Symmetry: C3
């Protein structure tokens, strides 16, 4: 299996975030208009998806990181990554 | 291979949908502001992607479900899932 | 491994683009309101993700194509595909 990516963007600049799962680790590369840099997001995963929405001045990002049959939602809401309430079943 | 996900979101609440392909079946988990629940979407797939757009009061969702070399588009347009016109070639 | 897809959409029509990685090649299917057609995008990849944003009359698309541990960003900015500045590390 090749590395696996997920991408999202917001605004008009725009800002872009690209998440890459490589050998069980997801890392984050960021564009905010002038140069790519490495973002804070660094969590385990073989598979990744992402969605985002911009409300006011805060970007809200949800990254779904999967290893085996376990999917962990990671949340950015303008001030730090947290593990969210998402579960795959009740 | 780990489970594989795809995510989309809309509005300001927001609403989120997360599709998970697990052992050949795609299922759907939904957030509309207070609690995750299991959505109606339940179709075959080893791979999934999604996109969506909100027009008026109706969310329009397109889920691309793949098994082997066959990709099936599933459509939500506010009142039920249907298999759409998408084909991978003419 | 089944084929792998990524999808994006824009506008109200809407326009949809679906990228499919199949046997190391990514191809593109397009909807702009009346019929699916094959788009110009044709580049190597085992994995694909996409994001897009509409500014003025130009759609801007970013397709992240991965083979092995190499991820190539492809950019549409209204007048042709180009390989962008994205790198996975500095």
């Amino acid at each position: 299996s090749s590395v696996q990516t997920a991408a999202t963007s917001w605004g008009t600049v725009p800002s872009i975030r690209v998440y890459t799962a490589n050998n069980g680790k997801i890392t984050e590369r960021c564009w905010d208009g002038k140069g790519w840099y490495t973002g804070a997001f660094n969590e385990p995963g073989d598979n990744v998806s992402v969605t985002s929405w911009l409300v006011g001045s805060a970007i809200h990002i949800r990254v779904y990181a999967s290893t085996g049959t376990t999917t962990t939602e990671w949340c950015w809401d303008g001030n730090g990554w947290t593990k969210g309430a998402y579960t795959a079943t009740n």
